[PDB]
């Protein structure tokens, strides 16, 4: 999820852009034209607030560089299944309906008056005929990270932003479990993340192994996928892959074959499920403190793996060249008992 | 090369690059070797946890499994959250999430013999019958309403013992692990998703008593990796002045940061039973002198 968010990030500073001190404070505030293009929730907590956004779920860049947003045009008060993409200028020049507004199965507006968004910061009911455009889904303004926070319509803006930022700091555990409650944008956000392999053609698996897999295509071509095991991640954590397929199954194309870090059956899983209780207990949970049962400690429920990295080099010098050698002056045999011949 | 200060674990693999084997290397190097050390960390005190609703926290204490409160059927809880922080922060969503998680975990079966209840009119026809450890998903801005939760909480499947733990409101009767007697009032319980942040405790904890000293500034190194001491800001000097504490400030500025002979003598005195000798002239002052005397400004001392 962190990698996907970084790939989807929208920076506003750096070379060729304004600085922190010269940039005005107003630019850091929302604009009525941000709906559908840049999420208003996700944002760094630090001083770089408002200068780093994120694409919306359905946002697509036009060939010139103006962000677009899908819409279905109402011709005569009847919803149209076909959809078109509109930019800011064209969006302003038209009437955009509300997705949550009830609509009959035949495309007829049950309500004569439907709320609508207007030129700028204007919303007002209008007859159900002049309305021209309607949104696609209620989730058209949220970011990818914010789109997977259940009951987001009940929290506060600051709390929602804090949770969204926190979601990008999880640590891959040893035994992940899929959440019991979570939006439907979990598996899709994992398949597109790239950290999970997937079959290209519908074939039948001949044999599987902890280190590699071999799938037989229906055309008679054998293919093999190699899965890296316990390779240090770019930030110090571990990354692994465990195939979740059995020997002798005709796996269809597009079906996940292995689960990467923070995954469980081809869907994101950044944590576990714990039985919580809400009550002050002897002040040990005083002022945001937390109490944990030893069952978690003794069952590896929240056990993680971290891999360090060190390197040494022997570079030539004017006084000579350094060489790595088992022997070392004035050192007891016990100290170097671990070094090998080389 | 030696392991830095505060690292341990197994050695999983060693990569060595040699110029003899025709391996590209940075100019002026012959043998660069890297070693990977992997350590398994178990969650401990001083670790951050937080849900998906932005409610951070730290592990105040890890009580034994025999001390945590347990449900009427003997199922000890795994974590306890404070309540005063919910209404002030105004993040009531997590309560609904916990209720829904408990409902999904326990499994439900909404009555339909007499017909779909009015509150269950909009529920999908395939969502009226669930199984234990079921999976549910509420898309943002379109999910179960309050009435849906009210109805679902009233039809949860009973435990294998034949009794239902939680009430319609969602609260339950517990039993104190220490006193052994039930609490006077019910409490809310349920399953809530918990992540693990990257701000571990092992990285933060660090100590330094005596170690390598910088050669250019004559000051102890900095950073946990280098095994260096902590910084001492000027606000700390202001605070020390405020209390009127003088000898402490003198030590902090002279006998533990700069004075070489001072450090040696005080260390030896502590090793023995002798009293700590008074500090001397800090290296900073002597450097300032020998530098200001370079601008023809005769800086005398006037010891008299």
């Amino acid at each position: 999820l962190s990698g996907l968010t970084h790939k989807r990030r929208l920076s506003a500073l750096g070379p060729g852009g304004l600085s922190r001190e010269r940039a005005g404070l107003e630019v850091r505030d929302v604009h009525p034209s941000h709906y559908g293009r840049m999420c208003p929730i996700e944002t760094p907590e630090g001083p770089n607030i408002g200068l780093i956004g994120s694409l919306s779920v359905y946002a697509r860049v036009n060939p010139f560089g103006f962000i677009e947003t899908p819409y279905r045009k109402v011709v005569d008060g009847v919803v149209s299944d076909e959809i078109v993409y509109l930019t800011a200028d064209e969006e302003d020049r038209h009437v955009v309906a509300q997705a949550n507004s009830p609509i009959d199965a035949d495309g007829r507006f049950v309500e004569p008056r439907v709320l609508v968004r207007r030129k700028a910061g204007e919303v007002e009911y209008v007859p159900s005929s002049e309305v021209d455009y309607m949104d696609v889904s209620p989730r058209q303004m949220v970011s990818v990270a914010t789109a997977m926070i259940p009951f987001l319509e009940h929290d506060d803006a600051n709390r929602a932003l804090m949770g969204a930022n926190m979601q990008r700091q999880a640590v891959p555990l040893v035994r992940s479990e899929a959440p019991l409650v979570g939006t439907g944008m979990e598996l899709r956000a994992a398949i597109d993340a790239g950290d999970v392999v997937v079959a290209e053609e519908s074939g039948v698996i001949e044999e599987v192994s902890a280190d590699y897999i071999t799938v037989m295509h229906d055309n008679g071509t054998r293919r093999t996928y190699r899965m890296r095991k316990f390779a240090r991640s770019n930030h110090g954590t571990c990354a692994n892959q465990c195939p979740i397929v059995d020997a002798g199954d005709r796996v269809e194309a597009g079906q996940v074959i292995a689960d990467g870090p923070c995954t469980d059956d081809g869907e994101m899983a950044l944590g576990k499920n714990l039985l919580v209780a809400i009550m002050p207990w002897e002040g040990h949970n005083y002022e945001d403190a937390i109490i944990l049962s030893n069952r978690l400690v003794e069952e590896d429920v929240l056990t993680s793996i971290h891999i360090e990295e060190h390197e040494i080099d022997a570079r030539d010098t004017k006084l000579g060249a350094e060489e790595i050698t088992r022997d070392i002056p004035n050192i007891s045999d016990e100290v170097l008992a671990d070094l090998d011949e080389r | 090369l030696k392991v830095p200060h505060g690292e341990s674990g197994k050695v999983i693999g060693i990569r060595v690059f040699s110029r003899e084997d025709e391996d590209e290397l940075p100019a002026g190097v012959n043998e660069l070797v890297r070693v990977y050390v992997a350590q398994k960390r178990k969650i401990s005190d001083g670790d951050k946890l937080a849900g998906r609703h932005g409610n951070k926290g730290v592990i105040g204490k890890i009580l034994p499994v025999e001390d945590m409160p347990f449900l009427a059927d003997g199922t000890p809880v795994d974590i306890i959250l404070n309540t005063h922080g919910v209404p002030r922060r105004m993040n009531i969503g997590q309560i609904l999430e916990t209720h829904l998680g408990w409902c999904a975990h326990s499994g439900w079966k909404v009555d339909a013999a007499k017909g779909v209840p009015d509150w269950a009119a909009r529920l999908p026809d395939e969502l009226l019958e669930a199984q234990p450890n079921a999976i549910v998903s509420t898309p943002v801005f379109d999910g179960a309403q309050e009435a849906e939760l009210q109805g679902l909480l009233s039809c949860t499947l009973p435990n294998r013992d034949g009794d239902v733990l939680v009430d319609a409101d969602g609260k339950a009767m517990l039993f104190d692990g220490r006193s052994g007697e039930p609490f006077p009032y019910p409490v809310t319980v349920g399953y809530m998703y918990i992540m693990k942040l990257h701000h571990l405790v092992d990285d933060k904890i660090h100590a330094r008593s005596t170690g390598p000293y910088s050669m250019i500034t004559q000051q102890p190194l900095g950073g946990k990796a280098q095994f260096g001491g902590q910084r001492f800001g000027e606000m700390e000097c202001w605070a020390m002045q405020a209390y009127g504490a003088a000898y402490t400030l003198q030590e902090l500025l002279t006998i533990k940061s700069d004075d070489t002979v001072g450090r040696v003598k005080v260390y030896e005195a502590i090793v023995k039973g002798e009293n700590i000798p008074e500090p001397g002239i800090p290296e900073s002052f002597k450097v300032l002198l020998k530098e200001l005397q370079s601008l023809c400004l005769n800086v005398e001392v006037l010891s008299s």
Binding site: R60, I83, A99, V136, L187, D192, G254, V256, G266 | -
Partner: peptide, 25 residues
């Protein structure tokens, strides 16, 4: 409506249908 072949089954509190799948992220 699971676009991917073998994703886990998790019924949802669906009330409205989105006429287009999420584009390639």
């Amino acid at each position: 409506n699971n676009s991917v072949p073998g994703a886990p089954n998790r019924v949802s509190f669906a009330k409205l249908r989105e006429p287009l799948e999420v584009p390639g992220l």
